[PDB]
Design a binder for this molecule. Structure first.
Ligand SMILES: NC(=O)c1ccc[n+]([C@@H]2O[C@H](COP(=O)([O-])OP(=O)(O)OC[C@H]3O[C@@H](n4cnc5c(N)ncnc54)[C@H](O)[C@@H]3O)[C@@H](O)[C@H]2O)c1
Ligand SMILES: NC(=O)c1ccc[n+]([C@@H]2O[C@H](COP(=O)([O-])OP(=O)(O)OC[C@H]3O[C@@H](n4cnc5c(N)ncnc54)[C@H](O)[C@@H]3O)[C@@H](O)[C@H]2O)c1
Ligand SMILES: NC(=O)c1ccc[n+]([C@@H]2O[C@H](COP(=O)([O-])OP(=O)(O)OC[C@H]3O[C@@H](n4cnc5c(N)ncnc54)[C@H](O)[C@@H]3O)[C@@H](O)[C@H]2O)c1
Ligand SMILES: NC(=O)c1ccc[n+]([C@@H]2O[C@H](COP(=O)([O-])OP(=O)(O)OC[C@H]3O[C@@H](n4cnc5c(N)ncnc54)[C@H](O)[C@@H]3O)[C@@H](O)[C@H]2O)c1
Lengths: 304, 304, 299, 299
């Protein structure tokens, strides 16, 4: 696929690297406001390509106009999410960038899927789509999903390949494990000794721990988000807990549920979950709506 | 995954090769009735492994008892399907083998998924599960699905990665394209100039053409079926038009629909298709039931 | 790489399959004299491609004229001794007249047997740079055997088989290393190894047969090493000048976007010796085979 | 392979990431002095693994004692001239006392700078077979540059950079080949190439910096070539005897389950020459650096 990267920070680069080396991206244009960053990153990529035999086309640019004719545009531009900053405050910071980008990118990229990575990620997507009018998904809880899976694996001392299931609903600390999806060696999770609350708060707390010690989350989200790009690029039909647009009284919101991801997206599979999880998902919609609507009002004091 | 192969014919070997070289299989036991075939195939595999650095464990055997402790058992043992032989006649040939195998394998392989490849494939699976009592899926119409996709790609002169969708229902000539799933560059299929009947009969006729000229179908089905094994082994959650057991008045039948395939299978996604395709799927169930029930009666003159 | 395949039977299909799913081949043209076989093989490839997201352009053809513009041409066209040389050298001489002017600058890789001898014939008549698969397969057979014998991973065995092809090949024991360590430090019945190499193909052939998966994958890896410019040392048979004629003998050779050098000079003295015996013996047998061909007469 | 990683910063994390998702590393132990960094890095790896189905065992540790039983040890522990040698040679001398008795039979791969010099120090004191990443990165920089300059795929450029590390490295022009053909047949400003190699890291470092993706991937490929026994020729710096001391100079070298031979003997005369200048110059500078270290005094 031809993929455009808006943001060449830590997560931008990890995502780009990982999707380029897997083959999911044959052609990429990489954009940032920082002068000469895209260019130097491109040199890095080209050196990495030599040892692998990768002939993919790559352009690092400081000119937004060079991002045109893309199939997918991955947006990771924005201030990071450190503990002590509320969702509301980050929203106020970062929505500006999305509103700006909504005015420029759609012009140069006709049928492009927009993939949001910048936080607060599902809210960033809802805003970007509100103003861009382009189809926009959020990476959502696919990362959370893989965190849950690896944790259950280490705890039971089994390979991760024996764990199935999804985290969904709202992003980050508001995420919920969809327990009706979770299976261990193919069997209901209730047959095993696992403490659900422990799993749930590992998932919610680990990104904060990682940021505290290292300064940022990269290898995990960047591979996981690159695997989303790959399932689109290769039309793999992987079910992923990304967040897709839904109409709700009657604004557009994004919430995560297991969704079929291929050359086309989706459908989402919320209708196939048990009662408890459909309930948690409904609740997530109500709460997202409330919070997002409020933040939208606040922001709209973009005075005079 | 630890995978057992019952049948080391042309399709057995292609499936085994393809799943071993992808990494989906770390451990395999390969079984056939033909003396020394498994053994010589194992030598071949080991030579192939040297150049790739593959350390997977492989055992070619003529003793059925060596196939134990497997996660997945792939059954491709049986006489092939040549034009001029009815489904009924092949059923009568091949059900015998499945009934035999249903009596031996479950004993040595506790929690194993059984994957049917031998034809008539969905009927072979229904019989194998009837008598083995083990969870059994059929490769179903996943091959048909990939045939449809590549045909639409060549006809429109686009990459296959821009085509999404599934074939389902009954196997082979009775398959139906699920048109509500089919999208080209993400858009409804009705927006493009494609002749649906042409696509449908390419899918139905091409395996016969290939068998006529070459004597058998291998590279296509064997990679496609190896990708099913891979989505189980790596817990990828690829949606695939395999055939899973359903209870119908109230015998167990297998029919294909898009199904989530991971470490756990599924659910199937028939409830999310449009009306026309849900109808075609219901019809497929009625017809399979009728035909399978009749063939079961016939076979049951296993006299005295 | 753009790769043309001459011969779409068992070994040609395997190599073409393996090289396409590894991503080493961007574009292929596949040719056979059997009517509609390449067409149907192309169909099988396209169905396999759909599941992997592979978008390489592939063309099955019954018209040799359609094989043009390639980077590498792989020749596996063959008929089922010495007679064997004559029978198949005619195929090569006919291809030698056709391929070069349609494939400016292409490299040729010989697979059809007798492989070293057929590479030599084809380069004489075509005048194009031609390599033979040589003893790379045997090399991998040797490594596979040692590793199974010592219950270790095949990734802990290093080494090459070289010289002549097939039952005349020699194990180059100064290259063989277990866990990074000289072979003489270990429990290795050399005769048992060398013997497994010579006999295992005949055994596979008898039961199956012949051989597809092993040499298909191994030879596809030569194509990969060329196409990705990996510089893998492999014991292919490259062309060498000897007594005014061009011959093919297998030795460890750097295989990249450029092919060479050979590494015979870096071997120990006994191995350098067996390789000279091999060049001499191959020359004699090649000229004796050329003679019996020159009986190409007009009744 | 079982691979231990000493240093889990920017370059150590990258190499460890790349080697694990390539499947070259079955098992890793990762160590750093920064408290809780390896633990958190291990968490990040596990989340990445879940999406790919990778099941390699990985351990982040703040206890060096936990790095035992490895096949390969990769050292990227470093402090941010000549002073640079002294500062980091202390790290190496301390590791030299600890690692060998816990890692019987392991191979060591030096990444921390000055890389050739640090490999040499560490093998003197540890007495273990030690290689340096050397000029493999530069080699890939050279290929990347030519190919972008001539608008061709990087897979059509072959060649190596060798001798000393970094700004003292030399392009080995007799190895450089475009489309399988001698470099002198093409439009190549050599000074422009050599100059791009020396200056591009400093430029990446200034803007970013420093360098992760490029050398991370390139060095992970050395690990891969060892672990899968691929026999890729790479210009790493292997140990050579010179004036009773052990030194590291980069040359094209076969890298497999066993490491070697070097290929300097197969170069042209000018390149053989620059490599001898390089061994001499590296010796002098290494002994001058050893001297200033031996001022390890007790106030
Ligand atoms: N799982 C996830 O969804 C996930 C994971 C990691 C990071 N993130 C989020 O992604 C964002 C980036 O994280 P990071 O580590 O890369 O931060 P970073 O500070 O490294 O990089 C952000 C980059 O964005 C650029 N930028 C800022 N405004 C821009 C604009 N208008 N146009 C183009 N570029 C612009 C900056 O120049 C910088 O290089 C944050 O919001 C973070 O919380 C999300
Ligand atoms: N898409 C698909 O589902 C697909 C594709 C190709 C082939 N097939 C089917 O798979 C079956 C095999 O096709 P093939 O090309 O490999 O045929 P084949 O004749 O090459 O091989 C079948 C093998 O099964 C073995 N066998 C027979 N009975 C056995 C028993 N009781 N136990 C163990 N082994 C036994 C034989 O010894 C033989 O080696 C056929 O029924 C064919 O129609 C299905
Ligand atoms: N290690 C090796 O190098 C190795 C391994 C296996 C086979 N081989 C050799 O390769 C050859 C092919 O083996 P196979 O197993 O594929 O046998 P095969 O008989 O299945 O294949 C031969 C194919 O070549 C085609 N062919 C014959 N003459 C031709 C011509 N003039 N032009 C185009 N196509 C032509 C035939 O139609 C047939 O499809 C044999 O000579 C075999 O000995 C070499
Ligand atoms: N091509 C190459 O060979 C190449 C490329 C890049 C970097 N490097 C070199 O590698 C080194 C690391 O670079 P970086 O970018 O990762 O820097 P960095 O500062 O991010 O990483 C250094 C890490 O090593 C750890 N460390 C320091 N002393 C240690 C000790 N005694 N034991 C264990 N860990 C220790 C530090 O805590 C830190 O995490 C530098 O010397 C750099 O010059 C070499």
């Amino acid at each position: 696929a031809k993929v455009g990267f808006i943001g060449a920070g830590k997560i931008g680069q990890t995502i780009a690297y990982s999707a380029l080396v897997s083959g999911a991206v044959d052609e990429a244009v990489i954009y940032d406001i920082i002068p000469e960053l895209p260019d130097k990153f491109e040199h890095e990529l080209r050196h990495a390509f030599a040892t692998k035999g990768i002939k993919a086309n790559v352009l690092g640019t400081n000119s937004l106009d060079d991002v045109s004719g893309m199939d997918i545009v991955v947006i990771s531009a924005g201030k990071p999410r450190k503990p002590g900053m509320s969702r509301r405050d980050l929203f106020v910071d970062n929505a500006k960038i999305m509103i700006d980008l909504a005015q420029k990118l759609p012009s140069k990229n006709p049928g492009a899927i927009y993939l949001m990575v910048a936080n607060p990620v599902d809210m960033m997507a809802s805003v970007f789509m509100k103003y861009s009018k382009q189809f926009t998904i959020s990476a959502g809880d696919q990362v959370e999903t893989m965190r849950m899976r690896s944790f259950i694996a280490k705890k039971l001392k089994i390979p991760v390949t024996s764990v199935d299931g999804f985290v969904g609903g709202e992003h980050g600390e508001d995420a919920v494990v969809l327990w009706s999806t979770v299976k261990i060696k193919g069997k209901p999770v209730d047959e095993f000794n696992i403490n659900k609350d422990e799993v749930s708060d590992y998932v919610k707390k680990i990104p904060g721990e990682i940021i505290r010690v290292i300064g940022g989350t990269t290898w995990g989200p960047g591979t996981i988000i690159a695997d989303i790009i790959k399932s689109i690029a290769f039309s793999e039909n992987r079910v992923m807990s990304i967040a897709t647009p839904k109409e709700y009284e009657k604004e557009i919101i994004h919430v995560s549920a297991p969704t079929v991801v291929g050359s086309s997206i989706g459908p989402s599979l919320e209708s196939l979950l048990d009662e408890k999880d459909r309930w948690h998902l409904n609740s997530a919609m109500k709460d997202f709506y409330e919070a997002y609507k409020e933040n939208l009002k606040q922001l709209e004091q973009a005075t005079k």
